[PDB]
């Protein structure tokens, strides 16, 4: 699959590396699971050494936080507003860390930046500016 090894790159001087062996399984790699908006749907992928990763494709509820009053209540996310990694990620409404999202402050009153790894943790968390 996708190998993260350094045998397909070049040297610091521009020279091309020459192959000696095939791909090694210790260089695993899995296709990104862009966490979009939608119903709760989280898969479980079996990683190396038997550990299980909560692989998330779509979630709508995320556990937020706001430190000025120390209250953490989950809420539904409306849509992604702005992303600092890529501009085409805004339209697809993907959920990635460090992406500005807009929410409904229904349980915060009675602009959120994601600070988790929803593709790996399986859940969405954030905070309020």
């Amino acid at each position: 699959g996708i190998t993260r090894d350094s045998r397909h790159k070049r040297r610091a001087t521009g020279g091309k590396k020459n192959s000696m062996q095939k791909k090694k399984k210790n260089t695993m790699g899995r296709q990104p699971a862009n966490t979009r908006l939608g119903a709760i749907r989280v898969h479980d992928v079996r990683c190396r050494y038997g550990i299980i990763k909560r692989r998330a494709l779509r979630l709508e509820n995320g556990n937020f936080s706001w430190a000025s009053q120390s209250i953490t209540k989950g809420t539904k996310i409306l849509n992604v507003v702005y992303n600092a990694s890529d501009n085409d990620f805004v339209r697809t409404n993907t959920l990635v860390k460090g992406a500005i999202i807009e929410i409904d402050p229904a349980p915060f009153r009675l602009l959120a930046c994601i600070s988790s790894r929803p593709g790996q943790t399986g859940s969405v968390e954030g905070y309020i500016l």
Partner: protein, 141 residues
């Protein structure tokens, strides 16, 4: 200071936000400009969480054209056993230059130290620098 797209924020941030500077280890001093400065760096040995391990080399800074990274040159020797004579050699190493050292220029002695892989070729941090002469090329970082 704050000019790029993403919100450049320091890894260890605390409200009075305070400037987090940790004191360095093996007999080095923290630069004065690094305390009162408004700069930000996520790989600086002082203001971030990168540790300098046992390996430590030194050399002369060769290039200062790369953003927050410089190239050091080490003109060492190699002993040829058969001829009983040494042949001069060199090796170039890219070291991550923190923006704490603003007067660093090409041709300045620098003490480097190992750390975790920061990029494809950069695996070291600058620890101190010393001034030298000039050649009309006062090229800083």
């Amino acid at each position: 200071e704050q000019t790029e797209r993403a919100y450049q924020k320091q890894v260890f941030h605390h409200h009075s936000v305070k400037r987090y500077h940790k004191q360095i280890g093996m007999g080095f001093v923290t630069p004065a400009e690094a305390i009162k400065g408004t700069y930000i760096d996520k790989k600086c040995p002082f203001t971030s969480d990168v540790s300098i391990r046992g390996r430590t080399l030194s050399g002369i800074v060769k290039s200062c054209h790369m953003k927050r990274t410089i190239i050091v040159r080490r003109d060492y020797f190699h002993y040829v056993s058969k001829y009983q004579r040494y042949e001069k050699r060199h090796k170039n190493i890219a070291v991550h230059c923190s923006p704490a050292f603003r007067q660093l220029k090409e041709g300045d002695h620098v003490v480097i130290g190992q750390c975790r892989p920061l990029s494809k070729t950069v695996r070291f941090n600058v620890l101190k620098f010393t001034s030298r002469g000039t050649g009309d090329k006062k090229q800083f970082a």
